[PDB]
Structures are given as C-alpha cells and as structure tokens.
Amino acid sequence: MSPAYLKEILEQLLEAIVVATNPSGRLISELFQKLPSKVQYPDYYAIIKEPIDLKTIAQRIQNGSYKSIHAMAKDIDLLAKNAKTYNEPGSQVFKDANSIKKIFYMKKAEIEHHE
Ligand SMILES: Nc1nnc(-c2ccccc2O)cc1N1CCC(O)CC1
Ligand SMILES: [Cl-]
Ligand SMILES: [Zn+2]
Ligand SMILES: [Zn+2]
C-alpha cells in the first residue's frame, strides 16, 4: 500500500470508532478523545505507564507515523488496555473500551476482506 492509500484506510477505521453509538444514542468514543487532566486525575498517570487517546492516534494518522494497519491496531489495543486497567470491570468506561476494540476489528475485517 502507498502511504496515501494506507491513510485513507486508517481514517475510515478511526471514523468508525468516533461515530459509533449505543442503542441509547450515546457516542461511546467520547470519553477516549482526550486523556484526563494530569492535575485533576494524577492517579491515572501513576498507574498508566503509556497514556494514549484518540486525539493522539488521529495525529499519528496525519503524521504518517503508522506504516501498517497493525501499528494503529496496537495503539487501539493499548488505549483499551489502559482504560480497562484504570476502570473497574463492568464499569461503563471498561465496557466502552471493549466496544471500541470490537468496532475497530469489525471494520478492519470488512475493509480487508471485501471483494
Ligand atoms: N475513568 C477514565 N478512564 N479512562 C480515561 C481515558 C481517557 C482517554 C483515553 C484513555 C483513557 O483510559 C478517562 C477517564 N476519566 C475521564 C473523566 C474523568 O472525570 C474521570 C477519568
Ligand atoms: Cl492488525
Ligand atoms: Zn495485527
Ligand atoms: Zn468489495
């Protein structure tokens, strides 16, 4: 894939995450756009050694930093793992983190397998 072709795929994957809603209409990605304040949420940075958010992933797409879909996927996995480490299982944030992963990998398969 050329860098320009790869970028279009990565943009479509991120878009699928950012537009996803639950049956009640809530944008499940909203909380993950921007990392919490280091001033107001210092425990997050004591616990999470490699913080990442969707804004950072979007910038990496614009910068061409990802050389494969897999590289973006690993950053999505890290975002979700961080959220699932900081938040209790069955909490809304924990569930939404898993939902972001499920959306990403479903969309990746739809793109990569379609013929
Ligand atoms: N409980 C949270 N867990 N994760 C995050 C979080 C954000 C972006 C990327 C990854 C993440 O893991 C943000 C959280 N809260 C934001 C709102 C605040 O009021 C309380 C903290
Ligand atoms: Cl992958
Ligand atoms: Zn992979
Ligand atoms: Zn097709």
UniProtKB/Swiss-Prot annotation:
Residues with the Phosphoserine modification: 2
Residues in Bromo domain copies: 2-111
Name of this protein: Protein polybromo-1
Full protein: residues contained: 178 to 291 of 1689
Tissue expression profile of the protein: Widely expressed.
UniProt subcellular location: Nucleus
Consequence the record notes for mutating residue 57 to T: Found in a renal carcinoma cell line
Oligomer and partners: Component of the SWI/SNF-B (PBAF) chromatin remodeling complex, at least composed of SMARCA4/BRG1, SMARCB1/BAF47/SNF5, ACTL6A/BAF53A or ACTL6B/BAF53B, SMARCE1/BAF57, SMARCD1/BAF60A, SMARCD2/BAF60B, perhaps SMARCD3/BAF60C, SMARCC1/BAF155, SMARCC2/BAF170, PBRM1/BAF180, ARID2/BAF200 and actin. Interacts with PHF10/BAF45A. Interacts with acetylated 'Lys-14' of histone H3 (H3K14ac), and may also interact with other acetylated or methylated Lys residues on histone H3.
Glycyl lysine isopeptide (Lys-Gly) (interchain with G-Cter in SUMO2) crosslink, residue number(s): 34
Protein source organism: Homo sapiens (Human)
Result for mutant: residue 80 to T: Found in an ovary carcinoma cell line
Gene field: PBRM1
Disorder named in the UniProt entry: Renal cell carcinoma: Renal cell carcinoma is a heterogeneous group of sporadic or hereditary carcinoma derived from cells of the proximal renal tubular epithelium. It is subclassified into clear cell renal carcinoma (non-papillary carcinoma), papillary renal cell carcinoma, chromophobe renal cell carcinoma, collecting duct carcinoma with medullary carcinoma of the kidney, and unclassified renal cell carcinoma. Clear cell renal cell carcinoma is the most common subtype.
Function description: Involved in transcriptional activation and repression of select genes by chromatin remodeling (alteration of DNA-nucleosome topology). Required for the stability of the SWI/SNF chromatin remodeling complex SWI/SNF-B (PBAF). Acts as a negative regulator of cell proliferation.
